[PDB]
Design a protein around this ligand. Structure first.
Ligand code: LFX
Ligand code: LFX
Ligand code: MG
Ligand code: MG
Ligand code: MG
Ligand code: MG
Lengths: 245, 487, 487, 247
DNA sequence: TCATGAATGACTATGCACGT
DNA sequence: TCATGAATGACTATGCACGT
């Protein structure tokens, strides 16, 4: 059991449950999204840590400089665990660490930066499956008479639209389908019913299979060697669509 | 170099600041209950078409449009004002429909301009109803490029409904919000008893407006402060939140606060109790837990000790926290460019006067426009009766000026009417189309008679305000939220 | 809960970021030399009518319109982008006409959004010239509400003219600006020698584009780096400021710096000299005084000691300060959605290709519209020849549809043409107006002939680009600023 | 008497001049970072220094002294002027013999003027008595003639006058671009500020004079003091006749 | 001493590549 | 380490009147 704040980051909106096994930390991109997330959460089990700006690349940055970064300190402090050799999973303050970023490319980038921090400083969190990725909605279908539906892809949008029209439901061609361009555009209710409500949220658990392969990929993508990264992108971007076929 | 005395400079400059702040910044106009920034934002949104019949526009566009045409100030504070008009815990009847993170009753700030969208609410659409029919005076904006409204039609009593708070110079205002349905009853009575004096009018209106109606619900304790405000323009209204005592399986009791008085910050409230228990000022309290959520609303659980009486702890909370707090009513508003502290009968009366003005001016505009159409229609009818000649005349004319000048002489017609004949399409020369012109003339002449009748009878004018307002209230009126109890 | 491997996640996410930054953020499109934000700002301003034929609009309105319709990002960074496009020391040929405080070449920041106004420049109007004539592909915006241009007409070679600098992922670009008149000569040659191979074209274009032309004037020392850039797509161009030695009666001699190389901050430059003298790494310097003003421009006076040689101190400045500094050219641009390092002949050719595409598409659009206009006019002429019948027919019709259907039968007409006759005003039945319709048909048929000729002859197409560009250069072309000298 | 100017122990916001002679030096106290920015660019750096003030200045009449001395903007003014305050005032250490207050023509500029004048009169009165305090009058309009040099107007009357004269003289204006209206110093660029408020050969300055000190003391206390009622009644009494003070 | 709310924006930190 | 330039906003302090 562990004490919650009511010696931790000022930005942290901690949970009420003192059991890490039952607790969850939502690491959120942006104060806006973090603000509404703090409101839509279940304050019993869910804590919110809003991150401001692009996270520092720990692969490139010197160790001392990383430790001066306020955002990194907030993450390390809030997780409670140490880093590197002083890592102690026993002091993990949340057994669920959900990264929640925009569906846009900068959200993807921030994800890579956070995953890099975790893999290099706090790897056991990934190995033991404490790291998750929240999948935000892309569309909100606003039916004239029926309850609104959320879609997490262009395909799901087309499907739910097709099904609803077939079922006799109707939509305005003005209000119509709201498209989310980021978590910041959502209110508290919307975030709950799409990314935080445990009965409907779409989480992806980050798994670590080959550590040596991961170590190599992290160094290529996130390291200081541009040429290696440049050639890797030109080599593999051509086939990024077909990774799951 | 010119010399100037410090006394002249100080007096002139400070008076200029004080007066503009008083009349043109901090205090509401009595007729629509709006400050300049509010009015300019709403009109900017309105003119831009950011209306409920279309999807929310990015809020930056509303701010920018307000900045560029009407309000020569900063984007930041203009956004703050727009945001406020969209918060259901700030305005009893929101004028802005916000989409996104607009903050909370606590210390959670609203999202930045970039993240939010916004449009006018249906009630705000009634603020601006028929503003384009010369129902209000317009003046040039800050650089004379465009016109802006001096006041809005305000087809519902917005000042009393949404209230107003403002710090000016030498004075300040603090008008609480009220229940629209109760205000309507007051207006309805004022319309029926249009000859009643101030003494009678105040008695009638005070019977119908039972007291302020806050967006945050809660309680009003006592009736003196409310009565004071309505009779004096000043009064102290005691507010309370709602507390419900809950018992536990162990037998422990806890206090659950689900409502707080108007303009009490939820987070400051919790922090205040927490700070008043650590220093030793609210003993009997065992634990403070905020079980609030977006789904259950406000829910502050105060577990009390076994050797503690619930009402004793509740009374202590009333004493030492804003669980009980007073609203300092000061009914100050601008009347005809002058700040004035007003009785409730005056606030209603002045609003009713504004409505009658709007209806008469609207009728005047519609009457003028009807006559213009009729005038042109008469010209067209003259052309149809002598259509063979009219066409032959235009054809045989070398120019259009020759054709026009000829038409005046041919049919004894104005130049405006003759111009209408020239602008006439071959479409309208069809049999049924010729007939519509005739019928339209008949139609309009009936409309003109109706309009003339309205202007001649103050009774109908009042009837229109009543019926139109009644329609608005039936559609957008809601239940009372703040419960009124006795001592 | 679905499982995902970290390698899969990292690779997909980072590649997606890298590719979007590369293609859709940091690097310029080769055809118009613009990044997405530039293109969207300019088009937003254009569509809003913020043009040189009207007064400057508040810059917030440009930001908001860009933000709300095309560019789904923050107001702050969009304003920064708009501001830069208005600074004469940043862009060799500014695309934004700024009104107010837009900062300085030093550390003086631009005024906030609220204080500044902005509109498109005449040259930016050439970027957008005839964009509404289907000269470029449009796509739906970020929410499908409206259309935006994928590229601008760019009726002057903007990429080479204004240059471009951008940091992407795995790569970066650094294209210097160039003198418009020199670029035009290269384009003119490319048009004349349209069949010339790459070797000849590169030689020709390199002869006409003598080197970069920076808005900050200054000097280019040597020719190797310039040659490298045009031949390789990469090259190091050594820049220098301008120094003028002045002597004082009795007093000592002083160095007066009136120009600095491209992208050297005036204040950082002065500070660098000052800090390298205090510690003592630039002996011979006695005093540093910034005599700059809005009226004399840059003027940094460096008084040197009496036992010091001016040329020695100047070389020391070249070595240890940015009085001499290199421009690291890397001619990287997006070509058909792919990043590519380009020779100067490729940059010109690709631009010329874009211009020809624009002219052909414009001609096609105008030909289609001309045919539509002619088609309807033919209908009108048929009506005039049988004018007596046209009127009589319409009269006897119960509807307009019966009148329409008859016209088809009467004159052998389309549904579109008959509708046009129906929509015709009696105005046009006057003699001169009937003649105007005839002559208008004749004019369009002549225009159609011209248009058809253009599409059939590549010679004319090239001729149009030449003549139109030449007109632009004659009007908006200016003298070279950066002086090119030998070693 | 000469004193050192900062060049790479004075306020960071201060853009000091080069001349070490206070008698020839001038301090422009400017409303807003934008206006101060353009002033720093359009000034004559030899004799003119710029101190931009950010936000409304603290009312020294209402606030206690300890709180006033903690206000960063007040500290900047006191430090830049070089003189002490109250009893420790020493005019000999005055770093600028011309202290020009330059605020917007709008009402908030007037307000800031009263706050600054209150600071000066209460903390550094001799600066007013000896005529070291001036008020810059910003332009309100810029007439942009099609062919002729643009003219600036400091009132609605002058606008109408210069407009009439120019048209009578055969000059012409666009009805679009036309007459630019300034709503604040921040809307002006460097050149405009120089040619209207900083160029000593064309600038319109007003020198603050102090006749009756006792009367001034009273007026300052009424308008700026803690007593609201006194201020309220004074405004209602005298606002009616503010137009006719110079008739 | 704190809240109100309509007025008067610079500073703070990262990603990314490349050259000093 | 620093500049470049588009990308990812909260915090900071006064005026002003009034009531706890
Ligand atoms: C991402 C948001 C919030 O974080 C930001 C900054 N912080 C990053 C880390 N913080 C510890 C302190 C500073 C910052 F210095 C600048 C900006 C900024 O310029 C900006 C914009 O739209 O222009 C938007 N943001 C910024
Ligand atoms: C007047 C400008 C510049 O000065 C400002 C502040 N300073 C006050 C005193 N300074 C020591 C440091 C901070 C401030 F705290 C807030 C704002 C602000 O919110 C704002 C706006 O448009 O909303 C505009 N400004 C502000
Ligand atoms: Mg985003
Ligand atoms: Mg603010
Ligand atoms: Mg920024
Ligand atoms: Mg101002």
């Amino acid at each position: 059991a562990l004490v919650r704040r009511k010696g931790l980051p000022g930005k942290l909106a901690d949970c009420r449950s003192t059991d890490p096994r039952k607790s969850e930390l939502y690491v959120v991109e942006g104060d806006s999204a973090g603000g509404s997330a703090k409101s839509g959460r279940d304050s019993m089990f869910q804590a919110i840590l809003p991150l401001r700006g692009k996270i520092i690349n720990v692969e490139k940055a010197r160790i001392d400089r990383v430790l001066k970064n306020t955002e990194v300190q907030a993450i390390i402090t809030a997780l409670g665990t140490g880093i590197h050799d002083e890592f102690d999973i026993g002091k993990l303050r949340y057994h669920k660490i959900v990264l929640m970023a925009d569906a846009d490319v900068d959200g993807q980038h921030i994800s890579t930066l956070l995953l890099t921090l975790l893999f290099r400083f706090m790897r056991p969190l990934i190995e033991n499956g404490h790291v998750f990725l929240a999948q935000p909605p892309l569309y909100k279908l606003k039916w004239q008479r029926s309850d609104p539906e959320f879609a997490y892809s262009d395909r799901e949008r087309d499907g739910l639209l097709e099904a609803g029209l077939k079922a006799g439901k109707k939509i305005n061609k003005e209000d119509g389908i709201q498209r989310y361009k980021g978590l910041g555009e959502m209110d508290a209710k919307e975030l709950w019913e799409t990314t935080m409500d445990p009965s409907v949220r779409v989480l992806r658990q980050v798994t670590l299979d080959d550590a040596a392969a991961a170590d190599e990929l992290f160094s290529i993508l996130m390291g200081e060697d541009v040429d290696a990264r440049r050639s890797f992108i030109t080599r593999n971007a051509k086939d990024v669509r077909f990774l799951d076929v | 170099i010119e010399p100037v005395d410090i006394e002249q400079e100080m007096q002139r400059s400070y008076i200029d600041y004080a007066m503009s702040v008083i009349v043109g910044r901090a205090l509401p106009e009595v007729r629509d209950g709006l400050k300049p920034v509010h009015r300019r934002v709403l009109y900017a949104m309105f003119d831009s078409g950011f209306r409920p019949d279309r999807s929310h526009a990015k809020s930056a566009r509303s701010v920018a449009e307000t900045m560029g045409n009407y309000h020569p100030h900063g984007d930041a504070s203009i956004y703050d004002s727009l945001v406020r008009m969209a918060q259901p815990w700030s305005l009893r009847y929101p004028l802005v429909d916000g989409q996104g993170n607009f903050g909370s009753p606590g210390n959670d700030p609203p999202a930045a301009m970039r993240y939010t969208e916004a449009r006018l609410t249906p009630l705000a659409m009634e603020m601006l109803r028929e503003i384009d029919e010369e129902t209000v005076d317009f003046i040039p904006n800050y650089d004379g490029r465009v016109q802006e409204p001096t006041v809005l039609p305000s087809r519902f009593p917005n000042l009393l409904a949404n209230g107003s708070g403002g710090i000016a110079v030498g004075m300040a205002t603090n008008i609480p919000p009220h229940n629209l349905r109760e205000l309507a009853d007051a207006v309805f009575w004022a319309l029926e008893n249009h000859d009643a004096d101030e003494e009678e009018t105040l008695a009638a209106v005070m019977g119908r407006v039972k007291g302020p109606d806050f967006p945050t619900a809660g309680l009003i304790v006592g009736s003196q402060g409310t009565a004071d405000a309505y009779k004096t323009g000043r009064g102290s209204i005691r507010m309370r939140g709602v507390v419900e005592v809950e018992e536990d399986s162990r037998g422990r009791t806890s206090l659950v606060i689900t409502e707080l008085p108007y303009q009490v910050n939820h987070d400051n409230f919790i922090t205040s109790i927490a700070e008043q228990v650590r220093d030793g000022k609210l003993a009997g309290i065992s634990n403070i837990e905020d079980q609030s959520s977006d789904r259950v609303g406000l829910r502050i659980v105060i577990e009390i000790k076994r050797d503690a009486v619930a009402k004793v702890v509740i009374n202590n909370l009333y004493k030492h926290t804003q669980l009980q707090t007073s609203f300092g009513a000061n009914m100050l508003a601008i009347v005809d460019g002058v700040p004035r502290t007003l009785r409730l009968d005056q606030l209603i009366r002045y609003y009713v006067d504004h409505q009658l003005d709007v209806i008469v001016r609207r009728t005047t505009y519609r009457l003028r426009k009807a006559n213009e159409r009729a005038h042109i229609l008469r010209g067209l009818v003259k052309a149809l009766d002598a259509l063979d000649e009219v066409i032959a005349l235009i054809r045989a004319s070398e120019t259009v000026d020759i054709a026009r000048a000829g038409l005046i002489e041919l049919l004894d017609i104005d130049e405006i009417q003759a111009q209408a004949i020239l602008d006439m399409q071959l479409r309208r020369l069809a049999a049924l189309e010729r007939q519509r012109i005739i019928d339209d003339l008949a139609k309009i002449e009936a409309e003109i008679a109706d309009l003339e009748d309205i202007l001649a009878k103050p009774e109908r004018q009042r009837g229109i305000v009543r019926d139109e307002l009644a329609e608005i209230v039936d559609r957008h009126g809601d239940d009372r939220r703040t419960r009124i109890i006795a001592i």
